[PDB]
Symmetry: D2
Subunit: 193 residues, 4 copies
């Protein structure tokens, strides 16, 4: 219930900064009746920009006025069966680099992005980097032998990791993988949290 | 930029969750082309409810997809002049209870809500109990004697604060004020944070 | 440098709450010279209880006065080779239940505890529970077929998960596993974050 | 309890990281028996440095192993009477610059540091610039006219605040005060949070 959430959250914030329907409606160029309406979940039709302005007026953020992602835990758990896991071909300049067998996700923890990654190429030098991403990542070499390279794309550090190897990659640090030269392909689990 | 922020964030999350315009538009029932537009700034007219399903599909929250409150500081600062304060006369049980002189606030501190409160009632017995509120609040008796009350509405704790008294009230703790009986009126600084 | 950290942090906090060496030394029953000394890293010999009292006086916590766990990232990464991963037999009432092949850890993120867990028993009913633990957990069925059971130890929910299954277990929720009846043994990856 | 807390936390972490007294005592070079004692409350005499290696072995921080600041509230509250404030006369360049009348503080809000500051100097030109400080600070001109300055020490921003002015200074922003030139003295409420 986006509207319901907004309705409860708007009300709170308004009172929080000591404003009555009238005070607020003014700053927004709206009628007190309207504001009062919104506090009823009748705001569902508001646009992103308006919500943007309402936040500004209330000196806070759209996030602060919208509700939590929600809960989807089955008494505290979510299960994803193997066959029903999303696949996503990944091409770096039309070069099939990875394949993403997306694992179980949850609104109770969106920062969590589990992945079984299929390393397609095995050309260490034809390895394409990523600028690094937000949140840390946990890696476990599933199959084959991954040839990891992190740091500066111009001259990065590196280590070929045998199956069984586990690695941590701090947030925002650039990295790239491929199999050991000539080995063909490899597999690893990638956990972004 | 309420959209611009949304644009780079939708992009961020889309990639984070290993998806493409093509795949995302699908779960939403939109044009693969349409998403692309959103990711380019054309999201401005998206309704609240509409934002709700999107953040859901990306198993995240609208907050996570909208930008932070802007930065409204003048080189990390902001002033408010005395004749510039918003005034809100409070009413509990149809009684000229308080008067809220709203002090400086910053988008960089949504939770900071500084107030000068003029306590108009001087009859403790007639005091009205808010239900408590979120966020801790620091108080300072500006003038007069503040007759305070906190805890349970029926059998509450009492405290007589002389001018200069300073107090802290934890978040969620219910409370009420008045000027000590007969003293007429009191004043105090109330900082919610 | 525990002492160095404390030395810098104590200094900050002291000034923060407006106290001079003398003011502080008093409340602690120490000499100003001593306090001044500590601010030099000469506090290394302080005991847990004393640090406990110093914190109290400064109205803060030992944590707030001690330094961050430190950094061990090799330019942003840590690698653990398969053979060098800690093993830990786990017996529930002398019943070899699990085996813990601990993966790469890091001071930059202690909440992260990666584990390859060897499910030894395969008696669903002889399954022993855990009261649930702090932080969420990500699970991936490595080998065999795990027989998961979560919730109330008296009557929990359950699902036998085929290899490839991935599950999320919210913090503090009780859980237990074993292989599918008769299958012998199973393996899964456990990520606590 | 500075130990009691440490005891249950060491226990917590030990288990969290999949270890036993036997294994932990090893990396520390202690008696498997010794750890057990720690886990039972006998940790009181552990030196700071000693705490440093322990938290290290458990790849975590001393903070994570020590308990939170206690709770010092009277049913979620605490008062401070005017003749009860700690007084600290400030000195910058050997000048009776400020005077700090320390208001109420709570262990439940380590960062809340409320102050009544008596500004003794009235020569802007003689003002001394702190280097900025952590945590945002809300100010209120109690009496007089506060001649303010913020930004760079050489070419700073100036602002003349009349009694009643309210201002916010972001964390890390350098600044200085005095009473407007010739006015003799000013007073203001400074709330660090
Ligand atoms: C394995 C890699 O970490 C996956 P990427 O972040 O490059 O998408
Ligand atoms: C003074 C009071 O603390 C302000 P209220 O909480 O009633 O809004
Ligand atoms: C697999 C389980 O999650 C490991 P436990 O938390 O019971 O130690
Ligand atoms: C008033 C000032 O803001 C207090 P200082 O930062 O100098 O400690
Ligand atoms: Fe990655
Ligand atoms: Fe209040
Ligand atoms: Fe677990
Ligand atoms: Fe300051």
């Amino acid at each position: 219930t986006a509207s319901t959430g907004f309705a409860e959250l708007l009300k709170d914030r308004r009172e929080q900064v000591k404003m009555d329907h009238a005070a607020l409606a003014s700053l927004l160029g709206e009628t007190p009746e309207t504001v009062a309406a919104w506090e009823n979940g009748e705001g569902g039709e508001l646009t992103l920009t308006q919500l943007g302005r309402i936040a500004h007026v209330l000196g806070t953020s759209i996030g602060a006025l919208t509700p939590p992602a929600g809960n989807d835990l089955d008494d505290g758990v979510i299960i994803q069966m193997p066959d029903e896991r999303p696949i996503l071909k990944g091409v770096r300049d039309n070069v099939d680099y990875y394949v993403y067998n997306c694992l179980v996700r949850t609104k109770r923890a969106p920062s969590l992005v589990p992945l079984v990654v299929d390393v397609l190429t095995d050309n260490p030098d034809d390895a394409k980097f990523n600028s690094g991403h937000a949140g840390n990542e946990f890696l476990f070499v599933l199959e084959g032998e991954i040839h990891m390279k992190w740091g500066d794309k111009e001259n990065p550090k590196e280590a070929l990791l045998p199956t069984g190897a586990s690695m941590f990659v701090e947030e925002h640090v650039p990295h790239a993988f491929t199999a050991a030269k000539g080995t063909g392909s490899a597999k690893l689990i990638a956990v972004n949290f």
